[PDB]
Design an enzyme around this catalytic site. Structure first.
Site, mmCIF file in Angstrom:
data_model
loop_
_atom_site.group_PDB
_atom_site.id
_atom_site.type_symbol
_atom_site.label_atom_id
_atom_site.label_comp_id
_atom_site.label_asym_id
_atom_site.label_seq_id
_atom_site.Cartn_x
_atom_site.Cartn_y
_atom_site.Cartn_z
ATOM 1 N N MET A 163 2.345 -4.103 5.796
ATOM 2 C CA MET A 163 4.059 -4.176 5.141
ATOM 3 C C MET A 163 4.468 -5.087 6.506
ATOM 4 S SD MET A 163 5.985 -2.466 2.096
ATOM 5 C CE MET A 163 4.858 -2.333 0.678
ATOM 6 N N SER A 164 4.461 -4.175 7.883
ATOM 7 C CA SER A 164 4.249 -4.492 8.919
ATOM 8 C C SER A 164 2.631 -6.282 10.020
ATOM 9 C CB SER A 164 4.773 -4.101 9.930
ATOM 10 O OG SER A 164 3.037 -2.714 9.793
ATOM 11 N N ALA A 194 1.270 2.047 8.755
ATOM 12 C CA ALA A 194 0.486 3.102 7.840
ATOM 13 C C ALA A 194 -0.004 1.870 6.622
ATOM 14 C CB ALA A 194 1.206 3.443 6.912
ATOM 15 N N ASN A 199 -3.143 6.216 2.074
ATOM 16 C CA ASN A 199 -3.350 6.224 1.110
ATOM 17 C C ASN A 199 -4.967 5.460 0.250
ATOM 18 O OD1 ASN A 199 -0.041 5.463 1.118
ATOM 19 N ND2 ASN A 199 -1.599 7.606 -0.468
ATOM 20 N N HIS A 212 17.989 6.306 12.952
ATOM 21 C CA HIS A 212 17.786 7.045 13.983
ATOM 22 C C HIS A 212 16.014 7.342 13.893
ATOM 23 C CE1 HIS A 212 21.778 7.267 13.140
ATOM 24 N NE2 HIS A 212 21.740 7.610 14.296
ATOM 25 N N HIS A 224 11.048 -4.743 9.314
ATOM 26 C CA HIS A 224 9.749 -4.597 8.002
ATOM 27 C C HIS A 224 10.907 -6.149 7.268
ATOM 28 C CE1 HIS A 224 9.695 -0.886 8.793
ATOM 29 N NE2 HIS A 224 7.866 -0.893 8.132
ATOM 30 N N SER A 267 4.804 4.345 10.279
ATOM 31 C CA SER A 267 6.056 5.227 9.831
ATOM 32 C C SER A 267 4.811 6.005 10.642
ATOM 33 C CB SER A 267 6.180 5.603 8.386
ATOM 34 O OG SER A 267 5.878 4.001 8.328
ATOM 35 N N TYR A 322 10.549 -6.489 4.399
ATOM 36 C CA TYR A 322 11.577 -6.111 3.466
ATOM 37 C C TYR A 322 12.109 -4.894 2.981
ATOM 38 C CZ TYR A 322 9.129 -0.943 4.621
ATOM 39 O OH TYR A 322 9.356 -0.203 4.912
ATOM 40 N N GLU A 323 13.031 -5.001 4.687
ATOM 41 C CA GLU A 323 14.844 -4.434 4.882
ATOM 42 C C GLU A 323 15.806 -5.592 4.554
ATOM 43 O OE1 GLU A 323 13.515 -0.648 7.938
ATOM 44 O OE2 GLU A 323 13.091 -2.105 9.088
ATOM 45 N N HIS A 357 2.338 7.969 1.848
ATOM 46 C CA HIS A 357 2.309 8.392 3.192
ATOM 47 C C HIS A 357 2.384 9.871 4.091
ATOM 48 C CE1 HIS A 357 2.946 8.559 7.334
ATOM 49 N NE2 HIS A 357 4.253 7.467 7.593
HETATM 50 O O1 LIG Z 1 -0.467 2.946 -0.739
HETATM 51 C C1 LIG Z 1 0.059 1.602 -0.103
HETATM 52 N N1 LIG Z 1 0.283 0.425 -0.918
HETATM 53 C C2 LIG Z 1 1.010 -0.782 0.035
HETATM 54 S S1 LIG Z 1 1.504 -1.776 -0.706
HETATM 55 N N2 LIG Z 1 1.435 -0.961 1.113
HETATM 56 C C3 LIG Z 1 1.862 0.272 1.781
HETATM 57 C C4 LIG Z 1 2.057 0.623 3.608
HETATM 58 C C5 LIG Z 1 2.458 1.729 3.499
HETATM 59 C C6 LIG Z 1 1.606 3.206 2.846
HETATM 60 C C7 LIG Z 1 1.030 3.219 1.897
HETATM 61 C C8 LIG Z 1 0.757 1.369 1.327
#
Ligand SMILES: O=c1[nH]c(S)nc2ccccc12
Ligand SMILES: O=c1[nH]c(S)nc2ccccc12
Ligand SMILES: O=c1[nH]c(S)nc2ccccc12
Lengths: 288, 288, 288
Positions: free
Chosen positions: C218-219, C115, C242, C63, C85, C32, C87-88, C256
């Protein structure tokens, strides 16, 4: 559980009862390169999974994929050549499925073998490792071969697993491994089931170590739930087919299907060991 | 999310609104042996999950399976007797499902209780444990009660969980537990949700400890995502129904449904505690 | 694997071959806030995932959801703006799906960005982190983008992942990051893929640290299996968006999409870095 009803399982057991001379007391499920043990069988009746009413069929040879009913060295065995893995796609309640038939077949002990990557540094390819406990990394997640409703016909909603692996037989095993005085030590160890089929990265290996595991592999800990859940006595071994790289460095050291007599000597080592151990399996009837 | 649309949830809330006098402010979801707390209710209207338009029905008594709308000690509660577990088979977005109706019902606080196996050695059967944080062992894997697309109507794509469990109420709780001066200490603790229903092996217990967890159990951490995701204020407790064997040794110590007054005294202990705590739940309206 | 056959993948590659001038050598998949990098493209031909025969469509803008074929700074790239992802909601073998087309497109290197929340304390929002290894927290569980049967057309049943992330390119990368003499350090790090979309709790963060991970996100670790499984050369970076709260305390620090030039300066920092690195990607032909 899922996808299968209790009748399916009876039907499958029933067909197998009514299609074989044998009543097996012991099921053995072999890991890769340990199928050879089905040779030790005598009066082998082979089944292709195929022919058996509900049995998951494998995913393509396949011909490492059979159920051979046998006599191993005492005991009436039924052996599984070509276990199911969740990495191949079934769900657990197709891995764990022979196990529930085995019971219904009147089997009361299950031995499981497998190949695992040794995580414990004190460990060497060729090593057998006697499973003392396991870590069920997919279990923690959902992926436990009992997920869905429980059939009190087979077991309890919340079977314990602290005692999955028999003290008695680990005792007997460990005895026996000395009784025939050996090569190296009979190791003992937590096996981590990790799903799912790439091999680990280093960071991953590192985790399974700090998590406490000695052998990492990818079958067992589902047969074992469904087995202990059923009441079978369970024990087993992992053939360490690999010293899992713990550590950063270059083109290095792995895996199982590529060692000389540290595939096939170790395989037979475990196979005989297993065959001998038949001798420690309590005969069934109460039977002294 | 999945399987349910937003209308389903409205329909379910709507039916419940238009079928009960009550507008509950607080939802409580009870763990095993804490259903008794639905007695403390007054002007109880009971629903079988059954009758409710979309609610997962349970998997068979079932009759530990009801939604009783109540007044507990101040507050307009709706309570859940017989929570869903993923080990039974739904997916999360059927566990987490009452929770999303509760919101739509205008509930704004959720209290969750459960029975967990204590992992923390400083812990004793009978202990209540106030949940400070959780470890979402199935969450890490896929299994999070928000997986699929997000309905901005309920919450954000990426809700935080660092604050799942209210400082305020853990504050209030901890106060209160002293305010009535007690028995043992009100413990506090990370609860690990482990799925999936065998109990752990030792090696497994060992892992959940080094992972940092105090109580291991098998519900909560899905109600809590869907709750915080929704904005509900969440807090809760685990009844330690077991000192989880950390350690190798023989026929030993477990579990919840088999202690005398260390099931049912502890249950009432938590139940009253919970009922009292109603008193700390901020009334809703801004309301000073 | 699942849901897709090999023909699907060819069909998809074929359509894309026969619909674009371009033969990309390198695929890039942006995380992202790094989609911006598709600007650096020249002679961009854009595709909506949409139009492409089998490609998962996204879940709604969407988009931020396109495949732009480009020239980045040497190389024939195909870039993915809006990765999938789990998660989606897809499964892995829809995340990992572009990756398998990219190969079939003749792509041989994949760069992944994302990210992540920094777990390593020596780490600061804005930091790029070069992925050295990963921990596949959903992989351990079932959730590996190769689960089901294996198509020897793409790879081996049991691909290794100890070397997912190129020594060479991490070498080259790390060189380059100095070669242009910089801001802060180019970090390096295990990325833990955690599924599944709430952010962690503290206890959870604590776990990923002791587990050894530096960036949690998470990817990646599914593109990477399917990539290494395919033979692509893989490397990548995480933008630390973060500093993950390791620690108990109040209303605090995340995330983020809410930093000033510590979103968009860092994004461009990584984006140029990535564009430059094109220069280190071995041209394909053997090609010296
Ligand atoms: O700050 C985060 N914690 C976790 S678990 N996953 C993320 C994924 C993208 C950006 C930040 C984070
Ligand atoms: O060497 C191995 N690593 C992992 S993760 N699993 C295995 C399973 C069988 C043989 C070796 C291995
Ligand atoms: O004693 C227990 N171990 C585990 S893993 N989960 C539980 C859940 C409820 C009660 C006890 C336990």
């Amino acid at each position: 559980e899922n996808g299968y009803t209790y009748e399916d399982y009876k039907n499958t057991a029933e067909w197998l009862l009514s299609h074989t001379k044998h009543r097996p007391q012991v099921a053995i499920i072999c890991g890769s390169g340990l199928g050879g043990l089905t040779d030790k069988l005598t009066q082998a009746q082979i089944f292709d999974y195929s022919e058996i009413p509900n049995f998951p069929r494998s995913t393509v040879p396949g011909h490492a994929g059979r159920l051979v009913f046998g006599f191993l060295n005492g005991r009436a065995c039924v052996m599984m050549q070509g276990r199911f893995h969740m990495y191949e796609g079934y769900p657990l309640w197709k891995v764990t499925f022979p196990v529930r038939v085995f019971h219904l077949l009147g089997v009361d002990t299950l031995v499981v073998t497998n190949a695992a990557g040794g995580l414990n540094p004190k460990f060497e390819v060729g090593d057998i490792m006697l499973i003392r406990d396991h870590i069920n990394l997919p279990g923690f997640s959902g992926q436990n071969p009992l997920r869905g409703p429980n059939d009190e016909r087979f077991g309890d909603r919340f079977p314990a697993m602290s005692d999955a692996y028999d003290r008695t037989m680990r005792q007997r095993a460990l005895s026996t491994w000395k009784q025939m005085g050996e090569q190296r030590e009979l190791q003992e160890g937590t096996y981590v089931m990790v799903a799912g089929p790439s091999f680990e990265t280093v960071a991953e290996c590192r985790v399974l170590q700090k998590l406490g595991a000695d052998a990492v592999g990818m079958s067992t800990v589902p047969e074992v739930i469904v087995a202990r859940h059923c009441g079978l006595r369970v024990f087993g071994f992992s053939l360490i087919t690999n010293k899992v790289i713990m550590d950063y460095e270059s083109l290095e050291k792995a895996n199982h299907e590529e060692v000389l007599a540290a595939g096939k000597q170790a395989a037979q080592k475990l196979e005989q060991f297993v065959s001998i151990l038949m001798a420690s399996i309590p005969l069934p009837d109460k039977a002294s």
